[PDB]
Amino acid sequence: YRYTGKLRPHYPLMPTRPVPSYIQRPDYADHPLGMSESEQALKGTSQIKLLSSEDIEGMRLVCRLAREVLDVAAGMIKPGVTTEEIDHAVHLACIARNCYPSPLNYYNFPKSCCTSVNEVICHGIPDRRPLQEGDIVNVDITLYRNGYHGDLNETFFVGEVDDGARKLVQTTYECLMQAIDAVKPGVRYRELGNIIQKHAQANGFSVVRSYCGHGIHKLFHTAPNVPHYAKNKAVGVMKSGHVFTIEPMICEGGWQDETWPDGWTAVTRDGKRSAQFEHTLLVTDTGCEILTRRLDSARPHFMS
Ligand SMILES: N[C@@H](c1ccccc1)P(=O)(O)O
Ligand SMILES: [Co+2]
Numbered sequence: 439y440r441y442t443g444k445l446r447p448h449y450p451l452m453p454t455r456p457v458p459s460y461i462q463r464p465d466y467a468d469h470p471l472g473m474s475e476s477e478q479a480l481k482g483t484s485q486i487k488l489l490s491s492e493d494i495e496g497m498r499l500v501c502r503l504a505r506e507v508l509d510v511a512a513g514m515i516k517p518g519v520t521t522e523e524i525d526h527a528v529h530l531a532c533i534a535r536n537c538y539p540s541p542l543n544y545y546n547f548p549k550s551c552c553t554s555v556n557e558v559i560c561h562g563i564p565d566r567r568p569l570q571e572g573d574i575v576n577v578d579i580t581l582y583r584n585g586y587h588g589d590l591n592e593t594f595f596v597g598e599v600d601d602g603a604r605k606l607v608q609t610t611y612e613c614l615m616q617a618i619d620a621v622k623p624g625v626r627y628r629e630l631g632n633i634i635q636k637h638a639q640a641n642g643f644s645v646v647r648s649y650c651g652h653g654i655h656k657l658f659h660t661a662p663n664v665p666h667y668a669k670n671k672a673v674g675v676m677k678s679g680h681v682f683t684i685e686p687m688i689c690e691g692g693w694q695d696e697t698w699p700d701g702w703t704a705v706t707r708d709g710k711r712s713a714q715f716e717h718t719l720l721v722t723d724t725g726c727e728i729l730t731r732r733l734d735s736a737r738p739h740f741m742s
């Protein structure tokens with residue numbers, strides 16, 4: 439395999455971390471190939487769930503808990519720490535909150551969160567590599583609690599980084615937030631990409647096409663599919679009681695992605711850097727509720 443950048447996986451991975459039996463497990467957690475029966479039973483479907491008042495409370499709880507765990511990860515970001523060490527604390531943080539780390543054995547994903555460095559677009563696998571000063575790193579957290587999934591991510595700076603790094607991360611965060619700002623009932627899910635790409639384009643960056651935002655509640659990934667690029671044909675119109683993520687990945691170079699031999703790690707084909715931010719959103723009447731927002735601080739971790 440020809441790597442696209444300087445990054446390399448650092449093996450071996452430590453043995454798969456166990457989740458105590460008292461933690462309620464999603465269906466794929468015990469399927470040999472990590473397949474989710476309930477998600478497959480809605481494959482190809484474009485209809486979107488309308489969340490009941492108990493659904494909403496369940497989503498509000500699990501998303502708040504997911505934010506707490508990402509905050510834990512944020513606190514460990516410094517040169518010298520390995521992505522495996524991050525993952526360990528995260529796994530322990532989920533358990534403490536009586537939640538299952540949603541990525542664990544999700545279609546055989548071997549870890550409890552995704553750690554994506556530099557040219558990794560998303561789905562990086564936590565490994566033995568020490569974070570290096572100058573790196574950018576995204577931690578993607580998804581928790582499972584009482585039948586509901588909560589999903590968010592932030593890109594972080596590792597010590598001091600360069601101007602391009604600062605620009606890429608700030609612009610990515612802006613794309614998300616401008617997208618979130620347009621969310622309200624009656625809006626077409628396909629419009630979000632127009633907004634994201636418009637801002638990415640104006641700053642000289644491209645927008646990944648192979649990965650999309652998604653509905654999320656009783657399923658990890660479900661309807662609607664939410665592309666981050668312009669002129670997409672996403673099916674659906676926003677409604678009060680809809681819950682989905684927006685998670686634009688933006689790149690320094692071109693938009694083309696490819697996957698490592700591990701079957702998960704998505705990297706820019708040109709080896710240039712990529713950044714991502716993610717929130718889970720609930721559409722209300724006056725707009726939307728950012729379920730994965732910080733409660734105790736105004737800004738994302740990278741600008742504070
Ligand atoms: N939370 C991410 C994820 C984690 C593990 C497996 C697949 C996607 P995504 O849905 O934000 O891409
Ligand atoms: Co995520």
Ligand SMILES: [Co+2]
Nearest residue numbers: 589683685716
């Ligand atoms: Co997601």
